[PDB]
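pls design
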């Protein structure tokens, strides 16, 4: 295993030795993170890890309370709620730390030294293969809008409820902002009487039963994980352009064991951690050198080139999504199109 240790500062490792501890608040399901925890501990067996697996709004609320109340909170925050992470990291909550594992991160995958992408997870199409074969599932917004004119598809579509899901909002908003054809598709959800879900599970359970045949906008990581045990679940990658979310990690400014947090963050971003995350958890890796299905190379091949993937950036530019006029405009269009 030794040749693939993450790059480390000896001073850090010796600090992290003295602390012994590492408080994670994370939106990654433990049973998906476990393999990374276990393998992180094998590299630094002198760090006792508190994985708190929490809802995204729970992490944001909890932290903001503990930090205001002046109490010991997390050492490290890891969340798919990109706008809430970037908000915390651009309001004084983050420890500035230049990760030696992030030297080749694109600028839009890090908030300078304040926060880092750990994943590159595409919004995909999923479909029950018993009801829609691969060859008739469109890979474009314009083709999907056409399929959803069919009376056989009425009531047979799931997508996000952007009014009940923060991640659903982020991904449909990014779609709306980047692809004019999303407006034709949103109208076609109205035509097909799309059902809107606040969770991936709720959606996927209705695709697997066949109560739906097709779900739009859910992430490739959850699909691949569910497909490991449901061979009737198909995945189609959009070839007219794909939006990708990035789980954001940052170190608490006021972390009590900051040096641990550095040794965990560097491990998450390393090829060892990214490899194990892609291979075990089926979470789509950020690092471009990972080999396997849940990886940038595989995504880029599936969509017809890297220039077809729009990564939602680890950038304060995404805080436009929190602007009440900018939400108003998108949600006005959405509710009219889908109802
Ligand atoms: O490109 C680095 C090789 C690793 C990454 O997953 C697999 O053999
Ligand atoms: C945040 As989810 C994977 O339950 O839609
Ligand atoms: Na940057
Ligand atoms: Na879910």
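designed seq:
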């Amino acid at each position: 295993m030794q040749q693939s240790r993450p790059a480390s500062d000896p001073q850090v490792v010796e600090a992290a030795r003295k602390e012994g501890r590492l408080i994670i608040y994370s939106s990654t399901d433990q049973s998906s993170a476990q393999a990374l925890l276990d393998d992180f501990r094998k590299l630094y067996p002198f760090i006792q890890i508190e994985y708190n697996d929490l809802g995204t709004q729970a992490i944001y609320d909890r932290f903001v309370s503990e930090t205001a109340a002046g109490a010991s909170s997390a050492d490290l925050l890891w969340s798919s709620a990109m706008e809430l992470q970037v908000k915390l990291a651009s309001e004084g909550y983050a420890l500035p730390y230049d990760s030696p594992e992030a030297k080749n991160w694109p600028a839009n995958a890090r908030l300078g030294n304040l926060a880092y992408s750990t994943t590159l997870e595409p919004a995909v199409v999923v479909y029950n293969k018993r009801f829609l074969k691969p060859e008739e599932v469109p890979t474009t917004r314009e083709g999907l809008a056409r399929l959803l004119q069919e009376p056989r598809m009425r009531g047979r579509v799931a997508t996000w409820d952007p009014e009940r899901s923060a991640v659903g909002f982020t991904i449909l908003k990014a779609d709306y902002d980047r692809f004019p054809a999303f407006q034709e598709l949103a109208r076609a959800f109205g035509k097909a009487q799309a059902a809107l879900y606040s969770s991936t599970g709720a959606a996927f359970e209705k695709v697997i039963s066949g109560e739906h045949y097709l779900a739009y906008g859910f992430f490739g990581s959850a699909a691949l994980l569910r497909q490991r045990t449901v061979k009737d679940l198909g995945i189609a990658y959009l070839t007219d352009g794909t939006v990708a979310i990035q789980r954001v990690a940052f170190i608490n400014k006021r972390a009590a064991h900051p040096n641990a947090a550095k040794l965990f963050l560097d491990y998450l971003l390393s090829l060892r951690g990214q490899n194990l995350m892609a291979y075990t958890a089926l979470i789509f890796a950020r690092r471009e050198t990972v080999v396997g299905e849940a990886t940038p190379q595989a995504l880029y091949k599936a969509v017809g080139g890297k220039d077809k993937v729009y990564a939602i950036p680890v950038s304060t530019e995404i805080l436009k999504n929190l602007d009440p006029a900018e939400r108003m405009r998108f949600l006005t269009f959405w509710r009219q199109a889908v109802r």
